[PDB]
Indoleamine 2,3-dioxygenase 1 (Homo sapiens), 375 residues
Amino acid sequence: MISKEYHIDEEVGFALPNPQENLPDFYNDWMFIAKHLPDLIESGQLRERVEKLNMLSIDHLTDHKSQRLARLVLGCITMAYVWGKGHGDVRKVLPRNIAVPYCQLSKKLELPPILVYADCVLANWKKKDPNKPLTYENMDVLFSFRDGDCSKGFFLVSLLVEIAAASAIKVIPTVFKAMQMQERDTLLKALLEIASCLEKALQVFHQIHDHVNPKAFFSVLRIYLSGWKGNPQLSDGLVYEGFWEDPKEFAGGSAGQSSVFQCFDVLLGIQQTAGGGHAAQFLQDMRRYMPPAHRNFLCSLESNPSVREFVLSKGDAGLREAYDACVKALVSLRSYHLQIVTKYILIPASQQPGGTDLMNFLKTVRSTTEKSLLK
Ligand SMILES: O=C(Nc1ccc(F)cc1)C1(c2ccc(-c3cnc(C(F)(F)F)cc3CO)cc2)COC1
């Protein structure tokens, strides 16, 4: 098993197992607003309602799950406050009452004070029936922004890919154990098992089309996930009133923030963070937007010896093929992600009376992955 300090679950991987839904009664004023985002945003009273809050101490958030739920609550409210109805009228100052505890909590959890993937995917879910399995029909999100925003489909399908990935993640220790102990047959089997699970993950990824509509994603959800780093709407970032005097820039939610998005690249020695380019920069930067336990896990993967070099040094076509099977599965996942950006961002952007930067990042990532094929 993976060490408990890395907060990786056998079943759900990097996802937070059975997330907490309700905070203490002390935080009811946060919870009410977060649970009623569709109505409060629509009616133009979210902002005043945030502005009416008293400053609540973070001391009553005792356990990790309650602390993560509070991050999810505060993060969603923050995006709602900043972006409002999503029509370009923006707040450049986050009020003291909310900003101080959010930044305090964020400092405690070692995450930046913005909604990240780890909040809105990994901690933003529940089973409808706890006795039934982890499928789309038996699941839903904890929070959404707007009616018809497709947050359920977008967050949960991301989560399901993340859960499919967990089957591969748990094999990682078998890979490194097999190398140090020089167990070629065991290593071969482990790599084939990883390939299998990543192929399954791709089939799970196909569900995005069933539950997410392009127009709604591009024109609504994408707006609420946007950040204030290199964003002309908040050119100098966002003022967190009471915590920092000067405005600070933070990137919005991204698949690049997923630990699965990087961990197989690291495992297999696909040097995604090498070469000094923009994509390498972004992936490294996005480790700061992951929970510390997961950044630490990626660190420990880096610090183990290279699987690529081991396979390359052995003159073993069988091992080479099992490694390539992993690389090829990653290639297909990257290609599929690209196809999704085309349908969900590029095309809607063209029909509107930008998205290229994301496409270029992903093309770089895919290209690097292809170039790692040994045959
Ligand atoms: O953008 C996405 N979700 C997202 C959610 C919240 C947010 F704040 C921002 C974004 C989508 C996506 C989901 C999974 C991958 C993915 C793809 N490939 C690998 C791989 F590394 F295994 F190849 C891992 C993941 C990670 O599991 C890529 C995108 C959903 O449909 C787009």
In short: DSSP finds 17 helices and four strands in the chain. The first strand starts at residue 93 and ends at 94. The two ends are 32 Å apart (CA to CA).
